[PDB]
Copies of this chain bind each other. A is one copy, B any other.
Amino acid sequence: GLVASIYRDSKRKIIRDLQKQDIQYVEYGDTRTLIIPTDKYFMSSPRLNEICYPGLNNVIRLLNFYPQSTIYVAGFTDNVGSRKRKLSQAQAETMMTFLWANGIAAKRLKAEGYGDKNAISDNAIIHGSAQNRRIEIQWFTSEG
């Protein structure tokens, strides 16, 4: 305790800042999910993104709370259309390279198989442009 006092308090603030930075954090059961609006976070140099986007920087800090969890990433530009699972798989890779480049063990990063039933798509939860173009980062924790 104390160094569990500081950690819990920090995490709550990171989550709140992410919220203000338009990044949603969804929690239910042992599932944790970050929903990133791709129209705001265009994303090549990890340096440009770290330096210019505080939100992406806050995503790293949060993922650093779970250094033992496998991090799953899903892409969804799945709004443009007709029959593009490609560009989705694509931006998912973009996020992964960014996460890796910024300290996340490559072994921990995994790309969600397209159409992965675990991905969130509920418009009751997803708000704004994220309903159309977005990236999701999901992991499982036993902190509860």
Contact = CB atoms under 8 A, between A and B. Distances in A.
Interface of A: 42-47, 77, 86-87, 90-91, 93-94, 97, 100-101
A97 B43 CA distance: 14
A94 B91 contact: no
This protein's copies in its complex: 2
A90 B86 contact: no
Given A90-B101, A101-B90, A44 B43 contact: yes
A6 to B, nearest CB: 29
Nearest to A103: B86
A100 B87 CA distance: 10
A44 B43 CA distance: 6
A24 to B, nearest CB: 20
Contacts of A97: 90, 93-94, 97
Given A46-B87, A46-B90, A93-B97, 11 more contacts: A42-B44, A42-B45, A43-B44, A44-B94, A45-B77, A45-B87, A45-B90, A45-B91, A86-B101, A87-B101, A90-B100
Contacts of A94: 44, 94, 97
A93 B91 contact: no
Contacts of A44: 42-44, 91, 94
The 10 A-B pairs at the shortest CB distance, nearest first, are namely A43-B44, A93-B97, A90-B101, A44-B94, A90-B97, A86-B101, A46-B90, A42-B44, A94-B97, A44-B91
